Amino acid sequence: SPSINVALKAAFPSPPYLVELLETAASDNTTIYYSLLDRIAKGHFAEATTDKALYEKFLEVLRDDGHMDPEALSAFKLALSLRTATPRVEAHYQYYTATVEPSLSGTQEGCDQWFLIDGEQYCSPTLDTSHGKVKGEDQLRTLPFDRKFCVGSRDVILYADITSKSFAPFHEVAMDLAKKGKASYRVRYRRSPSHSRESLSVNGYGVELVLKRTDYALGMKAASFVMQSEKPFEALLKLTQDFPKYSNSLGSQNVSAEFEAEHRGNREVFLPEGSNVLWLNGLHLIDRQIQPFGLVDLLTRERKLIKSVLDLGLTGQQAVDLLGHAEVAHAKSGDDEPRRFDWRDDIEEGQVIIWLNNLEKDKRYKSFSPSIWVLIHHFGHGLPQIRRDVFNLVVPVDLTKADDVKIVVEGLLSFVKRLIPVRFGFVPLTPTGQAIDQAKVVYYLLENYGLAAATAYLEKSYEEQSTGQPNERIFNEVIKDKSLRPDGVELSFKDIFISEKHEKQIHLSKHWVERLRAGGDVPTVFFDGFPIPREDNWLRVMNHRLMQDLQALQQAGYFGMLNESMWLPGFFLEKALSRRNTLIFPEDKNELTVLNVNKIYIENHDLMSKVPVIEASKESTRDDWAALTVVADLDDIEGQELVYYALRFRKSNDGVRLDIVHNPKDTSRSPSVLAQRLKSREDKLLDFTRFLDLETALETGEFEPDVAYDCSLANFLASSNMKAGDNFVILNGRVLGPITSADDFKKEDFEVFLQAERRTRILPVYKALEDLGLDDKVSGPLSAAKLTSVTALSTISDLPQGIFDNAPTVRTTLFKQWNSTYTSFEVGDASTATIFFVAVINPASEIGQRWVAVLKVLSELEGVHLRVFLNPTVMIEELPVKRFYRYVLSSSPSFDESGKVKALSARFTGVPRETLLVVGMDVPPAWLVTSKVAVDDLDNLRIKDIKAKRGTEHVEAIYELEHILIEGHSREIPGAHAPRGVQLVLETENNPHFADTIIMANLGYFQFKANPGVYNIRLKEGRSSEIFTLESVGAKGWGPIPGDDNTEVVLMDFQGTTLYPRLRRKPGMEEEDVLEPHAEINIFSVASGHLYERMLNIMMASVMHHTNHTVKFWFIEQFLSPSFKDFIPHMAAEYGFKYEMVTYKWPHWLRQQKEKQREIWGYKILFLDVLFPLSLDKVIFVDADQIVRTDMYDLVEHPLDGAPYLYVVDLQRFRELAAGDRLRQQYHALSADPNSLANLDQDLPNHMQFTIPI
């Protein structure tokens, strides 16, 4: 038979089978994790014979008993076949070997499950007879895979090994520990050493067999041919795998027969040619979203969202038309559009903003008429010239730094100089020390001398030097140059420290900035109310709105409502609110942190009942109803004070379902009695005249410690990601954090939150349902809070807008709009469905085959309405599908003979015999797959040749995965600029100098090479720990979040750890990290194919014999065949030189390539300086053909001076001006259009020969 046999195997060994079940079934359920850990210590699971008969017991338990529904049993089986949760188990294997062992300083007598209590080791299960001691970085770090079994005054850990039966009692020892509310418990799994080197045969991969000789109406003959073989989903794929072979059959048995000809009312109504916008229940997907491992990690949160309302009283069809609705295009189109704000200084008392423009009284604008009607009748793309104040701008300035001062000095004084009919001004910021001392001179000069002098100093300060500490002798100049016209109050001189220039103005300078929160991560600008972020580029946001203000006001003019007696600045400040609560109206207006309120109060039977609730009385209407969750620390003066103001807020509105869950600071102080102080007097709640009435009820009530209450909280706080002591106000699911004090959210802000939330989410949730037919499932605040939390997970993109490539989640209703007949059908379960893949795929596509095979496996899920379409594209001149696919994805757990863990692989029967097929690996974008188990060729897979070469038509080549990426991106504060040049050494306690990948210009790119394990990330001592400092390596989103200062990253998945750290400057120095304050000779070369390998080899032999010195080597792993890998150490000993191998990965933002040749030149010249680590300098790549007779000394010993690089790698100049990082954006501009490169490894560096030297 003619069949290549390709399997994929992970480098890391197989985890035990019982615990693979124990993590997929009990993944995130705090309850379900410790329950499946009891049936093994009972007998049920510890009874099994083989690996088949252990999974079996799980399923019937996780269905009839009360774990999971059957429309997820098959999904459990599927993830178990794909071994998805397997790397998660290797994090415990690694934490033990790299952190648990360095503390473990004793003898394992035979105490299989040695306990960890109070920094001491106890082999004995009764505790008070030790065996060892705990060292440095304590294991009591709350790692997110040893979940919280209640809480207590002392934190305890155990390392159970379930493969051994000795775990049964030792596990039960600390089961009672947390039960009686005495201590906290968590189970971290143990390395079972009795295991074999059983390889983890990974799947979720595709097998590409490209055609090198590819170049010796078809997408319509084949298109009409699937609705002719009468197998709508099974026969669609039976073309998608071997299309390059099955092209002749498209000329035999009425293959044309244009019936789907009238079915060309598809593109001219919904979507153009040559694209596949795969729909998921309402939202749009991309490539980095539609694949194997990167898709099921997204099919469960939608599942949770949907059923949330089929309990309230709806269906899966009446949920897709409810989420993909007209009113849900407000979940995103609403928060970005801001509220009006108040900036008037007359609340401070006219003492803060200082003005450059004075439009009405200016003696430079008199040329215009002072009447209002000037703007009413105005024409042109430009601005309405007038002598009256309509527009206002306020810009804060950090006087010590030169970046913000430069703006008044230039930016503002340019718009004033260029006659803009807008009033520009600013406030002298008073935050970081010195800018306060340099703000008094600004007020001294303007009140006591005039506008000239203050501005003069500012400019003349910037032009001369830029005074860090206010300069006096340059101030004497400004005095003795403009000392005339001292209006209001007269001179003081030199030492400013009086009762006004010093006092009033600086105090009220801070009063006004705090009232509208600007001083921080975002130095926020203003303009006729509405906020403006200055975290990167302010110029765009206020300028687009600038044109939109005048035509908005013109409508009021058109109607005459604008009287001649009306102040034009105080027009946009009519709605306007006092204090901008940033928690309600964020900086980044597209970022609503909402965790489904229905998902919270539903699997926590004690915590969601023992809460002092005040229902939204049935005395009032429907839209008032809302469940303001108030989770706060009532044992603190800035946590119990918000509880009483929220209570007071309920008094005013009968639409408040109040919640007062105690969030205690003190862990030994069992929460329940504090909650019982408010649950005892819950009947007559919010009937308290003063705060003192609430403060006397928290002393009277020494209740019994209900330890059952504190354990359900330990299941809620972890799920909702919450902190203790610090507070968070919630309404229908919307978190505001970190509520430092009760001043951040007074009662006069509880209404403001109800305004915006009613506006954006509350009201439209009822309107979507009113024009639908199910308006009777809005039971009180309850349903309405579940609805306003389901529709919030629709506008939350999985990927922050501006990294991978946009991914804007938009829920619309056009997916199902297309006449559904010829190329249309709905295979699978429909009305009783859970996941709704209403799809639209074209058969002529490079990855459309992969999606046909991925969605085949997702279709096999119980209750899926995978609707399928078929748009017939025509735009092709050469072969559309140049490759032979086969997707390795299985639903029912793959099981072997006596139940062993079976291998999911790929095969090609009856495949072509006279075409070379390049075996390439298309698998999630974080897999350092390398070829290691082969005998034949990568570039050469003719079937007729191997039929003789090895003796049969079969192939026994097996590829090997060895690395799971940690791809990420670095940012900066204030400006989110690129932190490039920074050197970072990712490291564990056990493995110090491990690996280092530099930050690059493309939004601070980095990607660390590692396998499942617990890591941290250092900056190497060169320049980093002097001018740059990482506050938090953002392992938890772009955010930020008050509980993620974690400079620790742990990996145990497939897609890597998407790390978004927030590196910040040390205050002071711009001074770029990219610029300065084994052997002496080395060489690298590229290779692909057994023939390419041998022509490379003779170059290595004719380069370690001609020269009298030491030469190391640096070729690239995956391209090389296993034939070559068992060859280099041989020539490295008899000749006497050194091997070593380097490799990297093209990110999801950089132009990938089709045929494996263009790929090679991408990695060769752009990926150069990052391939080799920092502990190197000179490399001498020479093409895999030449021979070096020369002494290789006058190749390293060669002056370059400005020239970075058949080349001369100088990793000192290559890091100084970052020519590799430059060639990245150089290739980005000349790869979109193939109208610039014949080749890319010798034409990209020669185009920039004058700029980037040789």
Author numbering: 28 to 243, 292 to 1152, 1197 to 1324, 1361 to 1409
Copied sentences from the primary study:
Central to ERQC is the ER-resident 170-kDa enzyme UDP-glucose:glycoprotein glucosyltransferase (UGGT). The full-length Chaetomium thermophilum UGGT (CtUGGT) crystal structures revealed four DsbA-like domains (TRXL1–4) arranged in a long arc, terminating in two β sandwiches (βS1 and βS2) tightly clasping the glucosyltransferase family 24 (GT24) domain (Roversi et al., 2017). Overall, UGGT's motions can be described in simple terms as two rigid groups of domains moving with respect to one another.
To probe the functional role of the “clamping” motion uncovered in the present analysis, we engineered four double-cysteine CtUGGT mutants, CtUGGTG178C/A786C, CtUGGTG177C/A786C, CtUGGTG179C/T742C, and CtUGGTS180C/T742C, all designed to form disulfide bridges across the TRXL1 and TRXL3 domains, clamping shut the cleft between them. The presence of the engineered disulfide bridges in the remaining three mutants was confirmed by mass spectrometry. The crystal structures of CtUGGTG177C/A786C and CtUGGTS180C/T742C were determined to about 4.6-Å resolution. Both crystal structures show the TRXL3 domain tethered to the TRXL1 domain by the extra disulfide bridge. As to the UGGT clamping motion, we tested two a priori rather similar double-cysteine mutants, CtUGGTS180C/T742C and CtUGGTG177C/A786C, both designed to clamp the TRXL1-TRXL3 domains shut. Surprisingly, the two mutants differ in their ability to reglucosylate urea-misfolded bovine thyroglobulin, with the former mutant more active than (and the latter mutant having similar activity to) wild-type CtUGGT. These observations point to the possibility that each misfolded glycoprotein substrate may depend to a different degree on a different subset of UGGT inter-domain conformational degrees of freedom. The three motions are to some extent independent of each other.
